Amino acid sequence: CGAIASTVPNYNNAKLPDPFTFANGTALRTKADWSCRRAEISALIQNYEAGTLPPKPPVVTASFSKSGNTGTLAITAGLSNSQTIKFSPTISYPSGTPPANGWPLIIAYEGGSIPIPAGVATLTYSNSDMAQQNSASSRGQGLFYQLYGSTHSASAMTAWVWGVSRIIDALEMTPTAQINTQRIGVTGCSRDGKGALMAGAFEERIALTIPQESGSGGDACWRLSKYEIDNGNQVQDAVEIVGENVWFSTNFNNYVQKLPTVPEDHHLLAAMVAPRAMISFENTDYLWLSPMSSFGCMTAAHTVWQGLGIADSHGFAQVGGHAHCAWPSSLTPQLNAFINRFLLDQSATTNVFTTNNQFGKVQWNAANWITWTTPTLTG
Ligand SMILES: *[C@@H]1O[C@H](CO)[C@@H](O)[C@H](O)[C@H]1NC(C)=O
Ligand SMILES: *[C@H]1O[C@H](CO)[C@@H](O)[C@H](O)[C@@H]1O
Ligand SMILES: *[C@H]1O[C@H](CO)[C@@H](O)[C@H](O)[C@@H]1O
């Protein structure tokens, strides 16, 4: 891919950054080009809003034990300077004999808030232990920072991603966990839905990503939410979110008032999942979630899957009429379709892209935000 850009000093675009053009002005043309564009997007997101995602450390070990239907995966991670941390997620297993290749698994941030089908194991990930997230007071606290240092630039969500990567490393080394590491999904609701999106985007071994009501800093776009808040919708936005918690790097503070200068938005974050599968779910009852911004953000991200000829690997379903993080039974068929196809190997059709258009004081106008023509990427 060559030397990937992590900063674009002269960038200034009030509309959504174009997925299909590299920072240097080179247009994407092949499906393989998307791998390099994803890597550039990774670098840009880390530089502007997420902080640094460390690579696998040189020590990662794991032991496993099981009591009844609950496994405990005891992980240790260590740096070359001997510093180490440990954490022990648990796994809830279906009973009986697993498939020949092991159970498909969903890594659920603090248990998630989706119903998980019977043939799928659930790993409960205590992401708040990995990086605290009470308020701005939490900056640099959590197991991640006991390894890398409390001034490490990673946001809380980037630290969470790191923990997921170590979990998957551990599973690959632990046959007795009886997990099919080729069929791992990730989910989370609300602030943990923001986290699940980051995990699926940055950790390519995740086969299915399921963010639930993730809102601002999740599947909503910064630029669209600024439009909402300026027009009287009481949405969460970039300016408020960096003061509320530590889900983003301290450096993001330098850009929340200057969003057009940021050469990325969360449509590119979501597009990092491609060519893997993702369906996110949103709720128009809570303007805090920035409903129009999520629909426009994911509509923009969808063009990447469309350009790759795999539109049905990316879903979006947005409805109203239920409490925050309550699962409406009306969406269970859509959720199960993605789980069935991408984790359970069924021939389920996954064409899901729906909203009720309940956006409050604004509307979605694609011509005001998307300026690119989706190319047909070759090869
Ligand atoms: C532009 O940047 C991309 C990503 O680093 C790279 O693959 C491509 O070769 C660059 N274009 C030129 C002409 O070097
Ligand atoms: C982001 O990272 C790139 C390398 O990918 C640097 O060149 C840049 O200065 C910034 O540190
Ligand atoms: C990209 O990022 C660098 C810092 O890494 C800035 O100096 C530059 O102006 C652009 O924001």
Residue numbers in the entry: 81 to 459
What do the authors report?
A common type of LCC in hardwood is the ester-LCC formed between α-1,2-linked 4-O-methyl-d-glucuronoyl moieties of acetylated glucuronoxylan and γ-alcohols in lignin. It was recently discovered that an insoluble hardwood lignin-preparation (LRP) is amenable to enzymatic hydrolysis by a glucuronoyl esterase (GE, EC 3.1.1.B11) releasing aldouronic acids. The overall fold of the catalytic domain of CuGE features a large ten-stranded twisted β-sheet flanked by α-helical elements and a surface-exposed active site.
Notably, the cleaved variant Δ*dWT was spontaneously produced in crystallization experiments with dWT. c Relative stability of the CuGE variants. All crystals of the catalytic domain of CuGE belong to the tetragonal space group P41212 with two molecules in the asymmetric unit. In all CuGE structures, a single N-acetyl glucosamine moiety is attached to N104 as a relic of the N-glycosylation. In addition, signs of O-glycosylation (α-1-linked mannose) are observed in some of the structures.
